[PDB]
Amino acid sequence: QGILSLALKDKPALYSAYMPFVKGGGIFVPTPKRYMLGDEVFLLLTLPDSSERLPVAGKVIWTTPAGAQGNRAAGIGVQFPDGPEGEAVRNKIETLLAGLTTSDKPTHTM
Amino acid sequence: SHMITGIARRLVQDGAVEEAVARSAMDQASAAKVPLPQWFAEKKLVTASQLAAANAVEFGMSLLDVSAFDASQNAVKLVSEELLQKHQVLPLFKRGNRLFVGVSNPTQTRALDDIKFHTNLVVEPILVDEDQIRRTLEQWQASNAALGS
């Protein structure tokens, strides 16, 4: 439906959300709204480095449902578009994650 | 009374299959003593992706579109081709001590046990629909094969 929003306060939060294994980069957005894989979604993303809200016209590539086994948050994994706007978002995330890249810590996805 | 249940209810909620067909599938699966998800997979009442979406919500499992997965990061080599044929799973990704494995069947557990004892990694299942598993596995195997013999 409408505009999803995701605000990330710090680098651990960004690390949990980022999906480095997605082609072009992806980001996990917690939400109770149910989506289908391949849905196009619009996301307003705030990263820890500033209050600027980054538009992301993305694609649903991952879902976790309500009541998931274990302690997994419900939500959708959104793939970044392959043009310069999406590449810019992915670029900012991986530089913000400098030093967090090789971590073994679990994420919201994989 | 006779509420449509489980996967059939969700496929109806998702618009994938349709009331009388879902009720029939539930009853026929019961008459045949076949688990409902296996019944739907065998009878091809819906697409594999529609079934995966229903399985994910019904069994509380995450679901991934592996066509969006970066092949160069695949973890296929960690699992013997023997296990891959036996179980029809798609090893996805390794992070730290965890290996995420794509499955199309929400209740297969011996496959996960075999992979855990084979890899000695922590195995975590992720739903991937059955068509995506068979196709993507061979694509990723071609990619891995380019690395050498």
Residue numbers in the entry:
A (entry chain C): 8 to 117
B (entry chain A): 9 to 157
Reproduce passages from the article:
Native and selenomethionine PilB12-163-PilZ complexes were crystallized as described in Materials and Methods, in space group P21. Two native crystal datasets were obtained, one with the wild type sequences and another with a spontaneous P70S mutation in the PilB12-163 subunit. Initial phases were estimated by single wavelength anomalous dispersion. The asymmetric unit contains two copies of the PilB12-163-PilZ complex (chains AC and chains BD) and the overall structure of the heterodimeric complex is shown in Fig 1G and 1H. Structural alignment of the two PilB12-163 fragments (chains A and B) and the two PilZ molecules (chains C and D) show that they are very similar with a root mean square deviation (RMSD) of 0.6 Å and 0.4 Å for Cα atoms, respectively. No electron density was observed for the last 6 residues of PilB12-163 and the first 8 residues of PilZ. PilB12-163 is made up of two sub-domains, a four helix ND0 (α1-α4) and an α/β ND1 (a β1-β3 antiparallel β-sheet surrounded by three helices (α5-α7) and a string of three consecutive short 310 helices (η1-η3)). The ND0 and ND1 sub-domains are topologically similar to the MshEN_N and MshEN_C domains, respectively, of the V. cholerae T4P ATPase MshE. It is noteworthy that X. citri PilB sub-domain ND0 lacks the specific amino acid sequence motifs required for c-di-GMP binding found in the MshEN_N domain. Specifically, in the PilB12-163-PilZ complex, the carboxylate group of the C-terminal Met117 residue of PilZ makes a salt bridge with highly conserved Arg103 of PilB while the Met117 side chain fits into a hydrophobic pocket made up of PilB residues Leu72, Phe77, Leu100, Phe101, Phe108 and Ile134 and conserved PilZ residues Phe28 and Trp69. The NMR spectrum of X. citri PilB12-163 indicates that it is at least partially disordered on its own and becomes fully folded upon interaction with PilZ.
Type IV pili (T4P) are thin and flexible filaments found on the surface of a wide range of Gram-negative bacteria that undergo cycles of extension and retraction and participate in a variety of important functions related to lifestyle, defense and pathogenesis. T4P filaments are produced by the polymerization of pilin subunits in a process that depends on PilB, a hexameric ATPase associated with the bacterial inner membrane, while pilus retraction is powered by another hexameric ATPase, PilT. In Xanthomonas citri, two cytosolic proteins, PilZ and the c-di-GMP receptor FimX, are involved in the regulation of T4P biogenesis through interactions with PilB.
